[PDB]
Amino acid sequence: NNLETYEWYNKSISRDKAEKLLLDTGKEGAFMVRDSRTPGTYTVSVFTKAIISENPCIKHYHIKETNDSPKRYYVAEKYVFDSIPLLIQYHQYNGGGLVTRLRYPVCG
């Protein structure tokens, strides 16, 4: 899938760089994605200035891969999406199962 079109998608970035890069934003909601070696199971790097023990903190919500049809990617046990662009958008607004409903994307 050509995710290079989106912003949250970033393969040229690693976890360490993902955790730091997001830190630069220093904004609550700052969310992004990081390609994974898997054949189809990227990762949603969610950064939200929260937590007391460790702040800031990065939430690595690894899209639950459900090799089914449909049933594929999802992160909330609520609803399942057959694509990442949906899970990323469905959370942009409305409401879902996310510590900090996505509302602020990041880019390189």
Partner: protein, 63 residues
Amino acid sequence: GSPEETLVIALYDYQTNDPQELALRCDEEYYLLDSSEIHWWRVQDKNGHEGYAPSSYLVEKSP
């Protein structure tokens, strides 16, 4: 003292955006029923308000 279930609290003043989510009153507190989840930790308000509460804004009180 944190035997089987720990307790968490909201750092800021997170507000519920949906019935599913659990409203928090910066200073409130509850218990932990599902810490296995990476997103929400099904907590139970003393009043009886059970809902998905934000793990981030939350943190195990611990001893």
